[PDB]
């Protein structure tokens, strides 16, 4: 409550009084052995008493802020606030000395360098209040504060990262060094060098053509020019100055406990710190107990599912998998350090996951040959139909036994049923079945086209079946395209056709509504929980199709399958080898279908177990159970208590985890190791990936993440992060496929070869580089855009 706060007198955690930037300076001030330019902060309550008229306008949209901005400029600061300003300013050099006017709120406001005089500073303080109402700051009522510290006139300045911004390696240190002052509004006109330090050794130096530099002229800041070889020839910092700055950086990192973003200035051989912020863009570290250097591999990349998962979702995958895993950033990992400490164990993993995709193999070889990260090495055909029915009989008994149970023994029941889930999924008979399919295997693929009893194939095909019973009744499309409303399946009967489509739509939801995009995450909304997700894909099947499209495109397959059956005819060992393949491989996607069925049954049982948690007065909202791990959730039910400061923490963490993309290889130092494609005799421009389906075509790119933005017309090419079996019904309206992750024999990869759809997977950052709308080119090998 003091009007003016000096840096070394700032109270921990009261940001609201001083602001983030000021609290940072108030923290770096107490760091022994670190020089922070003396100064103080104008209390946010000085911004408040400087204000009856001002409220005239904060009600008016509780672009003419150019009157409310000039008001604060013309509104003069009270004599006492001005007096307190005079005292603390005189203690840090007084007037006749230069100071920096910096505002402290995320976002950005106005900061003014090198201001001298009482009148000039009073004006700039008011201009900083004005920065709150330029049409940028606009898109409530908050309190701003102003930092006033000694203006440094350095030879060099720049930024410092205690962790490599790209690789996220915490034992790496990046420095951006440039001559002259820093910029409040950074423009690409003051370039800088880039140094990289691991520990006391320089690992990388990038010198830049720095033609321009900002110098604090007697008052204000002119931008002079440097001599041609004062740019090139001169490192911004000497080899020792870089190391000195590095040590200076990790002394601040050790103080805050977190990797910091530090702004520095260099005057007369001495360094000064003007700002320090925690880095919030790093990929988190798996919480593991034994101390050595560790290498983790991404389960996400193995499962072709890179999206972040909620706690409860992570739990159910952990309980499903026998192998011990670890969680980091909403993704799961497997510690393979033990297998990379033995030569026999090393190779057997490299060539097992290697040719599957060179990115993993390259990433493995990357970590293996690192600078001593790792220790050196010291001197049956009738089998199908029952497995299907046994699965169906295993689901029916589960579903009518969960409605039986609730409370605490509900969790006792799920844990037990997970064991049954295991011996159905890991059933030797079930995996001996498709071993026969895969061992039955160029010539083999198209010979296996249009094989019945494939659960995901029917899902895509029956959607077309659904599409053609829907269609005559025109009367049912207008309502469909404005509906923001999830419960659209109620007003179908008030209209004609909608009743007869509902029956066809509900029958679909009975067999295929249990899936979704990323079924692996149990907490993710299924199709029957929100049928509004299938709207575009069904409309897309409506916008372009037949009376019985499911018949023909199915029909297409077996006749091209019916002219290859005997190119080879004109040797009867081969005839059923083809079938024991054909009549089987449709089952290769049923264990997946059987598992996620049990998922949804648990979910409904757990959700209603959460609905009783809101009526007991324990839960605020319904689906907050997603942010608790399984065992935590067991205890909340057994107790009647719960920490919501953890829940909200889980909520913001998950939101942070969504902006991240998991690495194929993650180290104990946080370093993200993805693979790299080997390329020459291939176009300069080309973005590289993995070949999946032979073919070359071009067309319009549709970068689509959710299956709700899936407005697919004819000549489009689908560009997404991953292709799930639930994504496969969309393969009827596209011409090409580009995914950030995929395999040579995922189901998407299979039906892409049957339809003749050229597809490329393993294309890193494909949903960021390829902007939606661009005409792109794709080839079975590599594929790049056409401007
Ligand atoms: N007291 C100071 N002396 C010299 N340079 C400074 C001082 N304060 C800030 N700067 C420089 O001004 C630049 C702009 O910082 P600032 O505008 O306060 O951060 P933000 O833009 O986040 O508000 C910084 O990069 C820093 O190098
Ligand atoms: Mg800054």
PDB file of N, CA and C in Angstrom, residues 194-236:
ATOM      1  N   UNK A 194      24.604 -15.400 -32.395  1.00  0.00           N
ATOM      2  CA  UNK A 194      24.010 -16.484 -31.625  1.00  0.00           C
ATOM      3  C   UNK A 194      25.083 -17.440 -31.123  1.00  0.00           C
ATOM      4  N   UNK A 195      25.279 -17.461 -29.809  1.00  0.00           N
ATOM      5  CA  UNK A 195      26.257 -18.351 -29.198  1.00  0.00           C
ATOM      6  C   UNK A 195      25.561 -19.476 -28.439  1.00  0.00           C
ATOM      7  N   UNK A 196      26.187 -20.649 -28.420  1.00  0.00           N
ATOM      8  CA  UNK A 196      25.661 -21.781 -27.668  1.00  0.00           C
ATOM      9  C   UNK A 196      26.735 -22.359 -26.754  1.00  0.00           C
ATOM     10  N   UNK A 197      26.410 -22.476 -25.471  1.00  0.00           N
ATOM     11  CA  UNK A 197      27.347 -22.994 -24.482  1.00  0.00           C
ATOM     12  C   UNK A 197      26.739 -24.159 -23.710  1.00  0.00           C
ATOM     13  N   UNK A 198      27.473 -25.263 -23.609  1.00  0.00           N
ATOM     14  CA  UNK A 198      27.031 -26.379 -22.776  1.00  0.00           C
ATOM     15  C   UNK A 198      27.465 -26.149 -21.330  1.00  0.00           C
ATOM     16  N   UNK A 199      28.768 -26.231 -21.075  1.00  0.00           N
ATOM     17  CA  UNK A 199      29.323 -25.795 -19.795  1.00  0.00           C
ATOM     18  C   UNK A 199      30.796 -25.415 -19.925  1.00  0.00           C
ATOM     19  N   UNK A 200      31.049 -24.106 -19.904  1.00  0.00           N
ATOM     20  CA  UNK A 200      32.391 -23.521 -19.961  1.00  0.00           C
ATOM     21  C   UNK A 200      33.125 -23.760 -21.282  1.00  0.00           C
ATOM     22  N   UNK A 201      32.424 -24.316 -22.266  1.00  0.00           N
ATOM     23  CA  UNK A 201      32.976 -24.455 -23.610  1.00  0.00           C
ATOM     24  C   UNK A 201      31.969 -23.969 -24.646  1.00  0.00           C
ATOM     25  N   UNK A 202      32.461 -23.257 -25.655  1.00  0.00           N
ATOM     26  CA  UNK A 202      31.600 -22.747 -26.715  1.00  0.00           C
ATOM     27  C   UNK A 202      31.383 -23.804 -27.791  1.00  0.00           C
ATOM     28  N   UNK A 203      30.124 -24.170 -28.002  1.00  0.00           N
ATOM     29  CA  UNK A 203      29.784 -25.269 -28.896  1.00  0.00           C
ATOM     30  C   UNK A 203      29.310 -24.778 -30.255  1.00  0.00           C
ATOM     31  N   UNK A 204      28.906 -23.515 -30.317  1.00  0.00           N
ATOM     32  CA  UNK A 204      28.426 -22.938 -31.561  1.00  0.00           C
ATOM     33  C   UNK A 204      28.478 -21.417 -31.547  1.00  0.00           C
ATOM     34  N   UNK A 205      28.898 -20.839 -32.668  1.00  0.00           N
ATOM     35  CA  UNK A 205      28.901 -19.393 -32.836  1.00  0.00           C
ATOM     36  C   UNK A 205      28.371 -19.017 -34.212  1.00  0.00           C
ATOM     37  N   UNK A 206      27.375 -18.138 -34.234  1.00  0.00           N
ATOM     38  CA  UNK A 206      26.832 -17.636 -35.486  1.00  0.00           C
ATOM     39  C   UNK A 206      26.965 -16.122 -35.539  1.00  0.00           C
ATOM     40  N   UNK A 207      27.892 -15.643 -36.363  1.00  0.00           N
ATOM     41  CA  UNK A 207      28.124 -14.212 -36.499  1.00  0.00           C
ATOM     42  C   UNK A 207      27.185 -13.634 -37.551  1.00  0.00           C
ATOM     43  N   UNK A 208      26.702 -12.421 -37.307  1.00  0.00           N
ATOM     44  CA  UNK A 208      25.720 -11.800 -38.184  1.00  0.00           C
ATOM     45  C   UNK A 208      26.204 -10.461 -38.731  1.00  0.00           C
ATOM     46  N   UNK A 209      25.677 -10.088 -39.893  1.00  0.00           N
ATOM     47  CA  UNK A 209      25.963  -8.790 -40.488  1.00  0.00           C
ATOM     48  C   UNK A 209      25.157  -7.713 -39.772  1.00  0.00           C
ATOM     49  N   UNK A 210      25.722  -7.169 -38.701  1.00  0.00           N
ATOM     50  CA  UNK A 210      25.043  -6.140 -37.924  1.00  0.00           C
ATOM     51  C   UNK A 210      25.409  -4.746 -38.418  1.00  0.00           C
ATOM     52  N   UNK A 211      24.572  -4.204 -39.296  1.00  0.00           N
ATOM     53  CA  UNK A 211      24.832  -2.915 -39.923  1.00  0.00           C
ATOM     54  C   UNK A 211      24.342  -1.757 -39.059  1.00  0.00           C
ATOM     55  N   UNK A 212      23.354  -2.034 -38.214  1.00  0.00           N
ATOM     56  CA  UNK A 212      22.711  -0.990 -37.425  1.00  0.00           C
ATOM     57  C   UNK A 212      22.861  -1.238 -35.928  1.00  0.00           C
ATOM     58  N   UNK A 213      22.907  -0.156 -35.156  1.00  0.00           N
ATOM     59  CA  UNK A 213      22.997  -0.254 -33.705  1.00  0.00           C
ATOM     60  C   UNK A 213      22.384   0.977 -33.046  1.00  0.00           C
ATOM     61  N   UNK A 214      21.697   0.763 -31.929  1.00  0.00           N
ATOM     62  CA  UNK A 214      21.013   1.845 -31.230  1.00  0.00           C
ATOM     63  C   UNK A 214      21.839   2.373 -30.061  1.00  0.00           C
ATOM     64  N   UNK A 215      22.110   3.674 -30.074  1.00  0.00           N
ATOM     65  CA  UNK A 215      22.887   4.301 -29.011  1.00  0.00           C
ATOM     66  C   UNK A 215      22.107   5.427 -28.348  1.00  0.00           C
ATOM     67  N   UNK A 216      22.154   5.467 -27.021  1.00  0.00           N
ATOM     68  CA  UNK A 216      21.458   6.504 -26.273  1.00  0.00           C
ATOM     69  C   UNK A 216      22.188   7.833 -26.398  1.00  0.00           C
ATOM     70  N   UNK A 217      21.770   8.632 -27.376  1.00  0.00           N
ATOM     71  CA  UNK A 217      22.279   9.988 -27.553  1.00  0.00           C
ATOM     72  C   UNK A 217      21.968  10.761 -26.269  1.00  0.00           C
ATOM     73  N   UNK A 218      22.632  11.899 -26.063  1.00  0.00           N
ATOM     74  CA  UNK A 218      22.483  12.721 -24.852  1.00  0.00           C
ATOM     75  C   UNK A 218      21.071  12.687 -24.243  1.00  0.00           C
ATOM     76  N   UNK A 219      20.049  12.790 -25.090  1.00  0.00           N
ATOM     77  CA  UNK A 219      18.675  12.482 -24.695  1.00  0.00           C
ATOM     78  C   UNK A 219      17.948  11.773 -25.840  1.00  0.00           C
ATOM     79  N   UNK A 220      17.233  10.698 -25.522  1.00  0.00           N
ATOM     80  CA  UNK A 220      16.583   9.902 -26.547  1.00  0.00           C
ATOM     81  C   UNK A 220      17.530   8.833 -27.056  1.00  0.00           C
ATOM     82  N   UNK A 221      17.178   8.186 -28.163  1.00  0.00           N
ATOM     83  CA  UNK A 221      17.987   7.101 -28.691  1.00  0.00           C
ATOM     84  C   UNK A 221      18.133   7.110 -30.202  1.00  0.00           C
ATOM     85  N   UNK A 222      19.251   7.646 -30.680  1.00  0.00           N
ATOM     86  CA  UNK A 222      19.543   7.648 -32.108  1.00  0.00           C
ATOM     87  C   UNK A 222      20.020   6.272 -32.556  1.00  0.00           C
ATOM     88  N   UNK A 223      19.947   6.016 -33.857  1.00  0.00           N
ATOM     89  CA  UNK A 223      20.442   4.760 -34.408  1.00  0.00           C
ATOM     90  C   UNK A 223      21.524   5.023 -35.447  1.00  0.00           C
ATOM     91  N   UNK A 224      22.777   4.919 -35.022  1.00  0.00           N
ATOM     92  CA  UNK A 224      23.907   5.213 -35.894  1.00  0.00           C
ATOM     93  C   UNK A 224      24.238   4.039 -36.807  1.00  0.00           C
ATOM     94  N   UNK A 225      25.294   4.200 -37.597  1.00  0.00           N
ATOM     95  CA  UNK A 225      25.775   3.134 -38.462  1.00  0.00           C
ATOM     96  C   UNK A 225      27.181   2.725 -38.069  1.00  0.00           C
ATOM     97  N   UNK A 226      27.453   1.432 -38.168  1.00  0.00           N
ATOM     98  CA  UNK A 226      28.758   0.908 -37.817  1.00  0.00           C
ATOM     99  C   UNK A 226      29.568   0.655 -39.087  1.00  0.00           C
ATOM    100  N   UNK A 227      30.891   0.740 -38.986  1.00  0.00           N
ATOM    101  CA  UNK A 227      31.762   0.544 -40.145  1.00  0.00           C
ATOM    102  C   UNK A 227      31.691  -0.900 -40.652  1.00  0.00           C
ATOM    103  N   UNK A 228      31.727  -1.060 -41.978  1.00  0.00           N
ATOM    104  CA  UNK A 228      31.476  -2.339 -42.664  1.00  0.00           C
ATOM    105  C   UNK A 228      32.062  -3.567 -41.971  1.00  0.00           C
ATOM    106  N   UNK A 229      33.347  -3.515 -41.641  1.00  0.00           N
ATOM    107  CA  UNK A 229      33.930  -4.574 -40.838  1.00  0.00           C
ATOM    108  C   UNK A 229      34.118  -4.065 -39.421  1.00  0.00           C
ATOM    109  N   UNK A 230      32.969  -3.904 -38.785  1.00  0.00           N
ATOM    110  CA  UNK A 230      32.823  -3.742 -37.359  1.00  0.00           C
ATOM    111  C   UNK A 230      31.585  -4.568 -37.074  1.00  0.00           C
ATOM    112  N   UNK A 231      30.916  -4.896 -38.176  1.00  0.00           N
ATOM    113  CA  UNK A 231      29.781  -5.804 -38.224  1.00  0.00           C
ATOM    114  C   UNK A 231      30.254  -7.254 -38.205  1.00  0.00           C
ATOM    115  N   UNK A 232      30.893  -7.642 -39.303  1.00  0.00           N
ATOM    116  CA  UNK A 232      31.386  -8.997 -39.529  1.00  0.00           C
ATOM    117  C   UNK A 232      32.476  -9.424 -38.557  1.00  0.00           C
ATOM    118  N   UNK A 233      33.610  -8.738 -38.660  1.00  0.00           N
ATOM    119  CA  UNK A 233      34.849  -9.101 -37.977  1.00  0.00           C
ATOM    120  C   UNK A 233      34.740  -9.153 -36.461  1.00  0.00           C
ATOM    121  N   UNK A 234      33.775  -8.435 -35.906  1.00  0.00           N
ATOM    122  CA  UNK A 234      33.691  -8.328 -34.462  1.00  0.00           C
ATOM    123  C   UNK A 234      32.580  -9.167 -33.868  1.00  0.00           C
ATOM    124  N   UNK A 235      32.975 -10.144 -33.064  1.00  0.00           N
ATOM    125  CA  UNK A 235      32.030 -10.844 -32.220  1.00  0.00           C
ATOM    126  C   UNK A 235      31.495  -9.840 -31.218  1.00  0.00           C
ATOM    127  N   UNK A 236      30.186  -9.870 -31.001  1.00  0.00           N
ATOM    128  CA  UNK A 236      29.548  -8.958 -30.067  1.00  0.00           C
ATOM    129  C   UNK A 236      30.168  -9.120 -28.682  1.00  0.00           C
TER     130      UNK A 236
END
